Amino acid sequence: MLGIFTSLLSSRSFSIVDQNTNQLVAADLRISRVNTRFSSVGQRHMLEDGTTKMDSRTIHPMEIIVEVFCPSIDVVDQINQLLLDR
Amino acid sequence: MLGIFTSLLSSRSFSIVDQNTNQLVAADLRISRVNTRFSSVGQRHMLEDGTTKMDSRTIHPMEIIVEVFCPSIDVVDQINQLLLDR
Amino acid sequence: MINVSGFGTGIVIVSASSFPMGFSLSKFADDESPISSKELEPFGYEMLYDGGLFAFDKAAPLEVSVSVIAGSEDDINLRILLNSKKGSFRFLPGIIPDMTTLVATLPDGGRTVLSNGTILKGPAIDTIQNTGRRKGNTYTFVFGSYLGAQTA
Amino acid sequence: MINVSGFGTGIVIVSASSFPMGFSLSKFADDESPISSKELEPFGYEMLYDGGLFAFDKAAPLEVSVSVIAGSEDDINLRILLNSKKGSFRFLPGIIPDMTTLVATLPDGGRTVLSNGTILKGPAIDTIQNTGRRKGNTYTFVFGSYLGAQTA
Amino acid sequence: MINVSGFGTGIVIVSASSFPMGFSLSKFADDESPISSKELEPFGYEMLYDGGLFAFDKAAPLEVSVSVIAGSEDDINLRILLNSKKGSFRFLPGIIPDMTTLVATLPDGGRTVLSNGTILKGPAIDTIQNTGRRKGNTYTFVFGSYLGAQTA
Amino acid sequence: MNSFLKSILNTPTLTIRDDVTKLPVWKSLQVKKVEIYSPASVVSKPLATKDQTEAQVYTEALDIDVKNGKIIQPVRLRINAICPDLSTVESIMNAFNDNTSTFAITSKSILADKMAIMTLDVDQSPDMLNAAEINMEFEQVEPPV
Amino acid sequence: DNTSTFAITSKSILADKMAIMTLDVDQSPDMLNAAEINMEFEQVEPPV
Amino acid sequence: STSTIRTGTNNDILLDDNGNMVILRDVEACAQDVRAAMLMRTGENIFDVNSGVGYFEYIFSPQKSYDDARKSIADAILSSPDVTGIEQLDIDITGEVFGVDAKVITIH
């Protein structure tokens, strides 16, 4: 997407990294699509003359949807552990 | 639609009239569709034997939906003013 | 007596990065159509209720197909153009990296220039037929600018 | 004996703004049909649940395809007419930009007048086919008004 | 003079696990095309609401079809390749089971290597035409990456 | 079909201008669609009148009263675009995370001032190996004077 | 009218004491001299 | 519903043979008002900034699009006490001049 121009050939696409131990989990995931959604709601008040005013905006957490293929069993239960982690 | 038999050739199909001054507004509007909708709700009471009775009917305002094409810029300003008029 | 012959046609393609100076095509395949394009569609219409009509502008692309003899030098050059990667070649954005300009000439002498576009598709390897020959490769372009060059 | 020949036919095309005085068509192509058109269906019908029939009136356009010999003056005139973008100039209300009328005469003497229409399709660049010649360029019009005086 | 012959060409097919050492193809059928392929479209384009043109890069596969005389050794080898199920054995990370390499040599001397692909369709029992002969078996490959070295 | 011959008075270029800086931003986008919605609310109750006065007095009424019954709601603007580079993407997201960001959007001929981002989508797929699809929405903060 | 009732007869089905609830009208280039209608009725009271 | 004091082709008080400063009634008061409004320039009105036509930034300066001039002129035609809506703006720019035509709608 422009920006970085590295000339490194074998770079890496989407990868989840653990933020505690700087480790990759489920590194062998065949990714198909990535969708990122942002959302916010602006509260509006209905005035007297006939106009309509806005006073502030509230931001909610974003969401990411990933579609993958699992080429083995280890990827499947690695994904299960990824979800169950608390 | 039958009814009137004009014998006038160049007539007018659709026109918005300013009911105060009997004036045409946005006369240069090519039209793609015109839809007219009526609506009413009848209040029913649920009897004892097993029947069901209705006492009266209520009528809500009709709605007209028109799809147009604006061949210029003056028509766009005229449409915006038509909306903002109070 | 109108001469519609296609003998002596030459074409030059110049590129922004891959071929900054350009090359020329003169070997045009025999079995296939040496050059062709699809019909341009710059207008539209629709129907009203008074019975009338309404006409308006519309966006329109232009696609050109060029065929060459397999094994020719021009085939190698167009193959190089097809192998170019759009992601590479650092440049300013929004200016269609590696713009390719095509200049074509007729036997008469009329010259036409087309710009603002790039190569779009073409073969990757050669193809064998039952007759034992090799198919003439085809390459498709898309352009953006209709430089009105029909000079005498 | 009935004579149904087309030799000796002419077309005069005049546009509202681009070509105020009009130009003439004389060099019609030989491989593709000179004048073609599509069927006009200004009627429709619907079925009632008892099996009855109901017929109404419907809005219907007319389409015509005109082919010329490539490289002639007619070809360049139609190319100029095709490159006329509708963004420019100014139009009377309820008129459509470039209200073009086409008057075509049959060789017998009968004439037909078509109006309220524009140009849609055409070739941006010439096509060199297998034999080594140039394909006859074809263009399309759409009209919304009718006439015709087939006695003269 | 340009030489576009196909006689004297060869194919060597290497599979990751089923055929570690590879096998060769020499008997190409005569009723159907020996080597065929589908166009490569690594580019696309989209239209902008002002009428402009924007071109990007697209992910594109490569497809190849080969045909052999029914009942030869090449046909049985390709049948063995087709019956190999990806469920069995294993693979290195990011490799695809049975990464098949295909090396094609042109009769001139130039050659081409293709990798990261597999066989995906073909016949299972032989077809007997109404003339009393057997149709040439045709199998289709697919590949992810390619190369070209047309010097010799 | 040349383009870049844009007619005056209607030049189809999307210009977005920061409200305090008044300098154009995100000029790297390639937009494909623009939508404008301008709703309003209309009373839906039977309403009552005197109905026996002089004609012009009653004409004075049924005005002013109708003004009480038509109040204009904000303006919604939608666009669709493809973002080629990176810095534009992070600039848009930074503007999104701020509560105090306003912009003025200019379409072919329609001016809309004091807007604000409400929704934003980004999509990546094999259909575009070096770009991303965007879906941003704006909504007017305060009416003009 | 709040006080309108009709009896509708189909091929063989009788439905008495009905009343209009919904009505639609559409005008399009498909029909240049007619209009499409979508009426809806509902029974006011049961029969005896 | 409006009024003003009549002025000449140069914006001075115009006096009759009787010398009476005349209170013009509607319509021609609207014409005089709009003529004065379109000629007022931006940055001249004290106590009301951002009112006027931006001639030196939108028309006389080199400009790309020329919709800004239309918007500014339409706004200055508006803000008059009596104007309802604007029917047509053309903006010719033929020749060296900058041709502007306008037709407005009032309550009367």
Automatic annotation (TrEMBL), chains A, B:
Q: Which domain of life is it from?
A: Viruses
Any idea what this protein is called? Uncharacterized protein
The organism named in the record is Pseudomonas phage vB_PaeM_E217
Lineage at the top is:
Viruses, Duplodnaviria, Heunggongvirae, Uroviricota, Caudoviricetes
UniProtKB/TrEMBL annotation, chains C, D, E:
Pfam families given in the database record:
E217_Gp32 (PF22764)
Q: Which domain of life is it from?
A: Viruses
For this protein, the record's InterPro entries field holds: Gp32-like (IPR054440)
**What's the protein name?**
Structural protein
Q: Which organism is it from?
A: Pseudomonas phage PaP1_EPu-2019
At the highest ranks, the source species' classification is: Viruses, Duplodnaviria, Heunggongvirae, Uroviricota, Caudoviricetes
UniProtKB/TrEMBL annotation, chain G:
Q: Which residues of the full protein are shown?
A: 98 to 145 of 197
Classification lineage: Viruses, Duplodnaviria, Heunggongvirae, Uroviricota, Caudoviricetes
Q: What is this protein called?
A: Tail fiber protein
Protein source organism: Pseudomonas phage vB_PaeM_E217
Superkingdom in the source lineage = Viruses
TrEMBL record, chain H:
Name the Pfam families for this protein: Sheath_initiator
In terms of domain of life, where is this protein from? Viruses
The identity of this protein, by name, is Phage protein
* Organism (species): Pseudomonas phage Epa11
